[PDB]
Design an enzyme around this catalytic site. Structure first.
Site, mmCIF file in Angstrom:
data_model
loop_
_atom_site.group_PDB
_atom_site.id
_atom_site.type_symbol
_atom_site.label_atom_id
_atom_site.label_comp_id
_atom_site.label_asym_id
_atom_site.label_seq_id
_atom_site.Cartn_x
_atom_site.Cartn_y
_atom_site.Cartn_z
ATOM 1 N N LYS A 167 -22.542 -5.795 36.600
ATOM 2 C CA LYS A 167 -22.552 -6.337 37.959
ATOM 3 C C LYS A 167 -21.159 -6.903 38.253
ATOM 4 C CE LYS A 167 -24.236 -10.912 36.522
ATOM 5 N NZ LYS A 167 -25.335 -11.581 35.768
ATOM 6 N N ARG A 179 0.825 -1.229 0.000
ATOM 7 C CA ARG A 179 0.000 0.000 0.000
ATOM 8 C C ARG A 179 0.858 1.278 0.000
ATOM 9 N NH1 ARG A 179 -0.869 -2.942 4.013
ATOM 10 N NH2 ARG A 179 -0.068 -2.520 6.129
ATOM 11 N N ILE A 200 -12.307 -23.195 33.550
ATOM 12 C CA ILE A 200 -12.288 -21.976 34.386
ATOM 13 C C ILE A 200 -13.620 -21.202 34.344
ATOM 14 C CG2 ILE A 200 -9.770 -21.703 34.353
ATOM 15 C CD1 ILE A 200 -10.087 -19.686 32.086
ATOM 16 N N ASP A 251 -18.301 -10.842 29.295
ATOM 17 C CA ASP A 251 -19.685 -11.303 29.125
ATOM 18 C C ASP A 251 -20.550 -10.261 28.446
ATOM 19 O OD1 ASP A 251 -22.404 -12.343 29.507
ATOM 20 O OD2 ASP A 251 -21.527 -13.701 31.009
ATOM 21 N N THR A 262 8.712 -6.822 8.944
ATOM 22 C CA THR A 262 7.980 -7.678 8.015
ATOM 23 C C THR A 262 7.677 -7.003 6.667
ATOM 24 O OG1 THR A 262 5.828 -7.033 8.939
ATOM 25 C CG2 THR A 262 6.953 -8.938 9.929
HETATM 26 C C1 LIG Z 1 -14.557 -16.854 36.006
HETATM 27 C C2 LIG Z 1 -15.108 -16.681 34.712
HETATM 28 C C3 LIG Z 1 -14.202 -16.331 33.713
HETATM 29 N N1 LIG Z 1 -14.641 -16.130 32.382
HETATM 30 C C4 LIG Z 1 -13.954 -15.805 31.247
HETATM 31 C C5 LIG Z 1 -12.608 -15.561 31.222
HETATM 32 C C6 LIG Z 1 -11.983 -14.745 30.269
HETATM 33 C C7 LIG Z 1 -10.611 -14.517 30.333
HETATM 34 N N2 LIG Z 1 -9.842 -15.073 31.365
HETATM 35 C C8 LIG Z 1 -10.460 -15.832 32.286
HETATM 36 N N3 LIG Z 1 -9.699 -16.353 33.257
HETATM 37 C C9 LIG Z 1 -10.182 -16.717 34.608
HETATM 38 C C10 LIG Z 1 -10.014 -15.478 35.478
HETATM 39 C C11 LIG Z 1 -10.150 -15.658 36.888
HETATM 40 C C12 LIG Z 1 -11.178 -14.965 36.179
HETATM 41 N N4 LIG Z 1 -11.796 -16.059 32.200
HETATM 42 C C13 LIG Z 1 -14.896 -15.722 30.269
HETATM 43 C C14 LIG Z 1 -14.877 -15.480 28.944
HETATM 44 C C15 LIG Z 1 -13.900 -16.011 28.103
HETATM 45 C C16 LIG Z 1 -13.941 -15.780 26.726
HETATM 46 C C17 LIG Z 1 -14.988 -15.047 26.163
HETATM 47 F F1 LIG Z 1 -15.043 -14.828 24.810
HETATM 48 C C18 LIG Z 1 -15.978 -14.530 26.987
HETATM 49 N N5 LIG Z 1 -16.973 -13.849 26.392
HETATM 50 S S1 LIG Z 1 -16.917 -12.204 26.328
HETATM 51 C C19 LIG Z 1 -15.857 -11.733 24.987
HETATM 52 O O1 LIG Z 1 -18.301 -11.585 26.104
HETATM 53 O O2 LIG Z 1 -16.338 -11.687 27.650
HETATM 54 C C20 LIG Z 1 -15.934 -14.761 28.359
HETATM 55 N N6 LIG Z 1 -16.083 -16.036 30.800
HETATM 56 C C21 LIG Z 1 -15.936 -16.274 32.086
HETATM 57 C C22 LIG Z 1 -16.834 -16.600 33.018
HETATM 58 C C23 LIG Z 1 -16.477 -16.799 34.356
HETATM 59 C C24 LIG Z 1 -17.482 -17.162 35.249
HETATM 60 N N7 LIG Z 1 -18.091 -16.009 36.004
HETATM 61 C C25 LIG Z 1 -17.180 -15.187 36.833
HETATM 62 C C26 LIG Z 1 -18.883 -15.094 35.142
#
Ligand SMILES: Cc1cn2c(-c3ccnc(NCC4CC4)n3)c(-c3ccc(F)c(NS(C)(=O)=O)c3)nc2cc1CN(C)C
Ligand SMILES: [Cl-]
Length: 803
Positions: free
Chosen positions: A647, A454, A528, A663, A474
């Site tokens: 939350k 480009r 996890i 989330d 690169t």
């Molecule tokens: C503990 C937990 C973690 N995740 C993740 C999640 C994401 C990244 N790292 C980690 N590592 C664990 C650390 C100690 C929290 N967990 C993720 C997660 C991983 C990948 C994803 F694409 C998403 N979806 S998003 C992009 O809408 O946040 C979410 N989801 C959870 C859910 C929970 C359960 N609850 C606390 C809600």
């Protein structure tokens, strides 16, 4: 006989169709429904024009004694008002109450389908009025939505609002109050110092100056523009002829919602004018607003020498026409909105050679040397403008934009310049680079293996990875112009400025962003999280040894609840999120069975781990977490995204103690007003529940709840209650109180104003947005600049990886 095969075609809401029977409603039927609905949890906020409409959608029903009405544990759907005879309840087949004419039951179903508690039965042959959720919610939706659109056209037809922006118009649309006037009611009296604009939405009204008829006004006429801008006595006495419907806007509400209307309007006019110059197009909205607020505005007669041979550096034509001259030569005519002075803005010492002469009666805005100096906070205009040009370039980049102000400035000051002959290799594919470049003049060609990729030019940039990594370039960058000039900064200088934690953050982020990953390369250490809808796994990348998080979601679960349309929209949001306190998606994966989301791994725990360890948070601790959450929400709201599920459950902490929002299941890109009832009920805003429309402002309510948890401990609404219904009731009508142990007046003020039920009185929901929250006294000692830059010591550094 054609030899092709043609395939074939294919609970509590069923029983009600049997009992329905069309019945023309009497006078006193409407008055019973008007009295019963006003006792309802949702409908008490509504007025007589809205409740009568909900009344017309009510259906008459017919029963005989001893029949069923609604079973326990059912899909809820209907809500009833009793019209004759008597009915009776049963809780686990154990009779409780008796209900005659007047009483209502089954209100919980109107909000959301919950399991029915009891079972109503018929004592005698008695009749019911009733309505479904779908119909009730849609009636509220279309009533409020038509009101919004009607009021917006009123805004669009009044001339004084013409120069408000789209966003400014929608905000004041919500400040419209509908006022009813009977025959013979005086709307405004001559001589009264009124402060209200009116329009006729439907009806007629007569205009009396000095008790003498002047004309009649019809549906479309408005009046009181000048009452929103100035203290003036009304010119006339308008009086209503037939029963008439007026949309009104008061000045006090406009000043709360919008600020001073003149100041807002002038900023828009001036910002549009200044943005026609290439110079001012790289000023910040705050800077342009400051020039607008401080510019000198003059009225000139025709044939006047506005400028000739003071300290004026820029001139904008607001009204009329002026003619520009170099010595004796006309060089142009400036009409409305055009301007002049680029040359002098850039070189503040240069003598003003031109002359500007008015052609007719005109209004002119002048920007002086000191007007600029104040705007920039510096007497060196030339250096500051240049400094700012560079600043606006690098703040568009992730690497530099969350750095502190001082860091960002030092870095800019350290920029140095070099010149290149056409065809010179500025960067050679394969060499280990150590410099970041921004193009000052000319153009360059990006190439890999010979093939050109480009072209880049004025104010583009390249090479930034060399600040974070020792690695081969690169692509090559070749000069494609005579005498290309680049600004540049060395890695060594970058490393004197950027301190450890932010550097670590940037090192880890750009690596894992950019390294490509196919599914088959992923070993999985452990689980996890398992939130029903999906499953989250800590995973290892074989080639690089970088760790990630893979979230796995079955197409069984996705298709199950009709979320075909919604999982596509969530992917779009999740992919675009590029903020330090919001989770960073790397890429997605398709399958026959389950969808997959690959993200950075967060290795410092959950926010709830922190507030269990810490207890009730002190001022500085609550500042840090609420401040961090504020920045993520602000980020989303600027992308027109509403999060809808704020939350502590949805907030992780990284290894350095800074927050990551996760989330995005409830998140949606806002397109006008939203109505879908979504969220965790303890954190849901009143306006979501009431079904009359909401926007981004709901996440600011949730901020209020969060802060309350942090400082006070329990939730502020429905802390004990398990019943979804009784939570929503406490949210809508309950008393907000604060424990005796909360000793900080500023914390309470902020909590009350975040938890203000009506969005228009809620802190952070005016034109200023989050600035009002950030500048609240609660945050008085809190450095927002160091927060984004990772220069604060957080409340809780996670020692080791907890899961
Ligand atoms: C503990 C937990 C973690 N995740 C993740 C999640 C994401 C990244 N790292 C980690 N590592 C664990 C650390 C100690 C929290 N967990 C993720 C997660 C991983 C990948 C994803 F694409 C998403 N979806 S998003 C992009 O809408 O946040 C979410 N989801 C959870 C859910 C929970 C359960 N609850 C606390 C809600
Ligand atoms: Cl280099």
């Amino acid at each position: 006989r054609c030899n092709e095969k043609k395939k074939a075609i294919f609970g509590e809401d069923t029983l009600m169709e049997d009992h329905l029977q069309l019945r023309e409603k009497l006078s006193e039927d409407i008055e019973m429904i008007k009295a019963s609905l006003k006792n309802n949890l949702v409908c008490s906020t509504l007025n007589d024009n809205e409740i009568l409409t909900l009344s017309n959608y009510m259906q008459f029903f017919v029963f005989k004694g001893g029949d069923l009405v609604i079973k326990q544990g059912e899909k809820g759907s209907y809500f009833f008002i009793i019209n004759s005879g008597k009915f009776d309840v049963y809780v686990n087949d154990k009779k409780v109450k008796s209900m005659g004419k007047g009483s209502s039951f089954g209100e919980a179903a109107l909000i959301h389908n919950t399991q029915r508690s009891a079972t109503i039965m018929a004592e005698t042959d008695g009749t019911l009025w009733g309505v479904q959720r779908s119909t009730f919610r849609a009636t509220l939706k279309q009533l409020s939505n038509r009101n919004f659109n009607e009021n917006r056209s009123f805004i669009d037809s009044v001339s004084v609002f013409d120069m408000l922006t789209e966003a400014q118009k929608n905000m004041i649309t919500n400040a419209c109050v509908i006022q009813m006037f009977k025959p013979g009611e005086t709307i405004v009296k001559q001589g009264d110092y009124g402060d209200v604009l009116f329009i006729l939405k439907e009806g007629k009204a007569t205009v009396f100056i000095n008790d003498k008829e002047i004309r009649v006004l019809n549906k479309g006429s408005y009046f009181g523009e000048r009452a929103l801008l100035y203290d003036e006595p009304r010119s006339a006495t308008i009086i209503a002829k037939e029963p008439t419907a007026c949309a009104s806007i008061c000045r006090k509400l406009l000043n709360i919602v919008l600020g001073n209307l003149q100041v807002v309007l002038f900023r828009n006019i001036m910002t549009e004018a200044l943005q026609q110059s290439e110079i001012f197009r790289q000023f910040s909205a705050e800077q342009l607003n400051d020039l607008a607020d401080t510019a000198i505005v003059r009225d000139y007669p025709a044939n006047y020498h506005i400028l000739h041979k003071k300290s004026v550096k820029y001139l904008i034509v607001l009204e009329g026409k002026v003619e520009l001259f170099l010595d004796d030569e006309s060089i142009g005519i400036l009409t409305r909105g055009k301007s002049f002075g680029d040359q002098y803005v850039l070189n503040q010492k240069q003598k003003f050679r031109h002359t500007v002469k008015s052609l007719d009666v005109c209004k002119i805005a002048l920007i002086t040397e000191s007007c600029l100096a104040d705007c920039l906070g510096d007497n060196n205009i030339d250096a500051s403008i240049d400094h700012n040009n560079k600043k606006s370039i690098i703040k568009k980049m992730y690497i530099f934009r969350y750095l502190s102000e001082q860091q960002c400035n030092l870095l800019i000051e350290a920029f140095r310049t070099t010149r290149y002959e056409e065809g010179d290799y500025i960067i050679q594919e394969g060499e280990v680079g150590s410099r970041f470049y921004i193009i000052k003049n000319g153009e360059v060609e990006v190439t890999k293996n010979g093939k050109r990729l480009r072209t880049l030019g004025k104010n583009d940039y390249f090479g930034e990875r060399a600040l974070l990594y020792d690695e081969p370039r690169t692509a090559s960058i070749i000069s494609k112009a005579t005498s290309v000039e680049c600004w540049f900064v060395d890695k060594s200088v970058f490393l004197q400025i950027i301190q450890g934690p932010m550097l670590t953050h940037l090192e880890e982020r750009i690596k894992m962003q950019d390294t490509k990953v196919e599914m088959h390369e992923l070993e999985t250490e452990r689980i996890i999280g398992r939130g029903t809808f999906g499953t989250v796994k800590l995973v290892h990348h074989k080639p690089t040894q970088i760790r990630y998080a893979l979230k796995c979601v079955s197409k069984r679960s996705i298709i199950s609840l009709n979320q075909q349309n919604n999982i596509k929209l969530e992917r779009e949001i999740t992919a675009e999120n590029d903020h330090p306190f919001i989770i960073r998606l790397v890429r997605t994966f398709k399958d026959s069975n389950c969808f997959y989301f690959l993200t950075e791994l967060v290795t410092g725990g959950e926010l709830y781990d922190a507030i269990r360890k810490l207890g009730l948070l002190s001022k500085p601790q609550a500042q840090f977490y609420l401040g961090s959450i504020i920045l993520a929400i602000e980020y989303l709201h600027e992308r027109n995204i509403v999060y809808r599920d704020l939350k502590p459950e949805n907030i992780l902490l990284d290894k350095q103690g800074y927050v990551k929002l996760i989330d995005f299941g409830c998140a949606k890109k806002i397109q006008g007003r939203a109505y879908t009832l979504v969220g965790t009920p303890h954190y849901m805003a009143p306006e979501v529940i009431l079904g009359k429309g909401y926007g981004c402002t709901v996440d600011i309510w949730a901020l209020g709840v969060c802060l309350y948890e942090f400082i006070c401990g329990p939730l502020p609404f429905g802390n004990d209650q398990e019943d979804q219904l009784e939570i929503f009731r406490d949210i809508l009508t309950g008393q907000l109180t604060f424990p005796d142990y909360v000793s900080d007046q500023d914390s309470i003020n902020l909590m009350k104003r975040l938890l203000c039920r009506l969005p228009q009185g809620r802190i952070g929901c005016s034109i200023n947005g989050f600035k009002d929250i950030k500048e609240h006294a609660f945050f008085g000692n809190f450095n927002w600049d160091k927060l984004a830059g990772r220069l604060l010591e957080p409340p809780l550094v996670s020692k080791g990886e907890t899961y």
